[PDB]
């Protein structure tokens, strides 16, 4: 695992912290403040923009921030991430980034695109965070808005687990509460 320091079970990091608890704390704090500076970004958005989001979030913690995952650690084998992520994003473009859809269709397509990017798992760390920012922003460009406020941890996971298996029903139910306006 080339992301780790040679001797240890800790991720190589720009603050050179060698304790697990401390690195986690500083990463939560610094990501939190970086998120508070991320701008909405363009309507036209692909893999580059997702990467851009992850660079901004993690630039203080990791020298590889904004780069696609380089090990396998269901999730896409690392060397195919760019190919399938560009394919996925080309398709989103063809549907005009979901802009102009009635609620129920929007929910249905958001669930689909969330599930596919999630399974792709494009970053070594921070995929879910960068992902949800990308769709918060996409939703706003399409006339909608996302709120994750009411959602139990265990339901979110289960719903992503069955989505990766081809049943998007629980992720759809979650998204019809998360989407509004």
């Amino acid at each position: 695992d080339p992301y780790l320091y040679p001797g240890l079970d800790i991720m190589r990091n720009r603050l050179n912290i060698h304790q697990q608890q401390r690195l986690e704390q500083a990463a939560y704090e610094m990501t939190a403040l970086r998120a508070a500076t991320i701008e909405l970004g363009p309507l036209v958005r692909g893999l580059p923009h997702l990467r851009t989001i992850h660079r901004q979030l993690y630039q203080d913690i990791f020298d590889w921030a904004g780069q696609l995952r380089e090990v396998d650690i269901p999730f896409c084998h690392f060397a195919y991430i760019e190919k399938e992520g560009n394919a996925l994003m080309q398709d989103l473009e063809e549907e005009g980034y979901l802009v102009g859809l009635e609620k129920a269709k929007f929910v249905e397509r958001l669930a689909h695109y969330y599930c596919e990017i999630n399974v792709l798992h494009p970053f070594r760390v921070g995929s879910g965070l960068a992902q949800r920012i990308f769709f918060e922003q996409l939703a706003i460009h399409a006339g909608y808005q996302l709120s994750w406020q009411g959602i139990e941890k265990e339901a979110w996971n289960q719903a992503n687990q069955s989505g990766a298996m081809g049943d998007l029903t629980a992720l759809q139910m979650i998204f019809s509460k998360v989407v509004s306006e």
């Binding site: 050179n16 203080d60 920012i133 994750w148």
Partner: protein
């Protein structure tokens, strides 16, 4: 709508980030700072490690 969209982003993004992080099981304080205030705080946190 492009300025309406950006302003809606700015007003929700931190609330989102807190609730998105709580999805993965971690409760952090809400960030109430503006971008420029948060940029200054980042340089302070870098000094502290």
């Amino acid at each position: 709508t492009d300025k309406q969209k950006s302003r809606l982003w700015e007003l929700q993004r931190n609330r989102n980030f807190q609730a998105s992080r709580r999805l993965g099981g971690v409760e952090m304080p809400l960030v109430t700072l503006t971008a420029a205030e948060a940029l200054a705080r980042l340089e302070e946190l870098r000094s502290h490690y």
